[PDB]
Amino acid sequence: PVAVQCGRLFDARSGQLKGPHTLLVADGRIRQVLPGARVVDLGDKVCLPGWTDLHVHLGSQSSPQSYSEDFRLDPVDHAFRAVGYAEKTLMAGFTSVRDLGGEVSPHLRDAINQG
Amino acid sequence: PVAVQCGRLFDARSGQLKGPHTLLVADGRIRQVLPGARVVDLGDKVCLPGWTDLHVHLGSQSSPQSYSEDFRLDPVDHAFRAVGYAEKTLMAGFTSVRDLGGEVSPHLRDAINQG
């Protein structure tokens, strides 16, 4: 159980920014949100839910050499690039993505789900 | 039966530049060379045998997009470029070439022989 103290909270269901709050996290879900356990303090920060990107291609990235790699590179190289792509995507605040094309993405999803 | 008058003749067997000469050409061969019929005058020019290039690749030419043409082009495009390549090679003074690689060059040779 982790108690996260938030200086300001954003209510996505209303689009309004509330005041200080406290979130109780247990078993990977939110237990209770109290206005006003290991303590994580973010009193001088604005808290939001994690963002979702509904159109990404985690198995590729545009490059001047992107129109010759169909005949030179292998899916394993794309997986090794996708590791860093996914880490960079997660660190930007996007905790969920919808992948819209690519043969590496299901395997990357399986690897992330397995830890 | 043409008579080519040359102001200065180069002796490829000896390597020495000779004086004015006259070449009699009939049936695609040199009939006789006379020191000193239609007439082709080159009085103020130097006459030499046609040059030979012993290493060419008439079915290709290097370019920034050369390494991607293996998967995007067909032999027909290479032949259409080789037409101009061969015309430019002939106009430069090289009446004979040895092509050392390429599967379009035998066909270009047959086409040139057929006229």
CA distance A52 to A32: 23
> Which residues, 6+ apart, have CB-to-CB distance to A50 below 8 Å?
A93, A94, A95, A96
Q: What's the resolution in A?
A: 2.7
Query: Helices in A1-115 by DSSP H: which ranges?
Result: 75-91, 105-113
Q: What is the DSSP letter of B36?
A: -
Q: Which two tokens stand for residue A42?
A: 């973010």
Cβ A77 vs Cβ A33: under 8 Å? no
CA distance A51 to B75: 51
Chain B residues in contact with A72 (beta carbon < 8 A): none
> Which residues, 6+ apart, have CB-to-CB distance to B102 below 8 Å?
B57, B58, B59, B60
Solved using: cryo-EM
User: Using only C-alpha atoms, what is the Rg of chain B?
Assistant: 19
Number of Cβ within 10 Å of residue A25's Cβ equals 16
Number of Cβ within 10 Å of residue B24's Cβ equals 15
How far A68 CA lies from chain B's nearest CA (Å)? Answer: 6
**B contact test, residue of A65, A68, A69, A72 with most B CBs within 10 A:** A68
A96-106 burial, b at 16+ Cβ within 10 Å, e below that, comes to ebebeebebbe
Answer whether A68 sits within 8 Å of B70, measured CB to CB: no
CA distance B44 to B7: 6
Residue A39, chain B, CB below 8 Å: the answer is: no
**A contact test, residue of B66, B68, B70 with most A CBs within 10 A:** B68
Residue B103, CA distances (Å) to A54, B55, B56, B60, B74 in order? 50, 15, 13, 11, 12
Number of Cβ within 10 Å of residue B108's Cβ equals 19
The residues that bridge with B3 in the sheet, in sequence order, are: B24, B39
Residue B23, CA distances (Å) to B2, B18, B20, B42 in order? 8, 14, 10, 11
Cβ A98 vs Cβ A52: under 8 Å? yes
Q: Which two tokens stand for residue B61?
A: 């030419």
A75-89 burial, b at 16+ Cβ within 10 Å, e below that, comes to eeebeebbeebbeeb
Cβ A6 vs Cβ A22: under 8 Å? yes
CA distance A69 to A62: 11
Phi/psi of residue A7, nearest 5 degrees: -65, -45
Chain A, nearest residue to B67 by Cα: A68
Residue B27, chain A, CB below 8 Å: the answer is: no
How far B67 CA lies from chain A's nearest CA (Å)? Answer: 9
Q: Which two tokens stand for residue A10?
A: 């954003």
B45-73 burial, b at 16+ Cβ within 10 Å, e below that, comes to eebeeeeeeeebbbbeeeeeeeebeeeee
Phi/psi of residue B56, nearest 5 degrees: -140, 160
User: Using only C-alpha atoms, what is the Rg of chain A?
Assistant: 19
**If DSSP codes are grouped into helix, strand and coil, which group holds residue B112?**
helix
Chain B residues in contact with A68 (beta carbon < 8 A): 67-68, 71
CA distance A102 to A79: 11
Chain A, nearest residue to B72 by Cα: A68
CA distance A103 to A93: 25
Residue A64, chain B, CB below 8 Å: the answer is: no
CA distance B82 to B110: 13
The residues that bridge with A25 in the sheet, in sequence order, are: A2, A30
Q: What is the DSSP letter of A102?
A: -
Residue B102, CA distances (Å) to A24, A88, B38, B66, B73 in order? 73, 47, 41, 15, 15
**If DSSP codes are grouped into helix, strand and coil, which group holds residue B41?**
strand
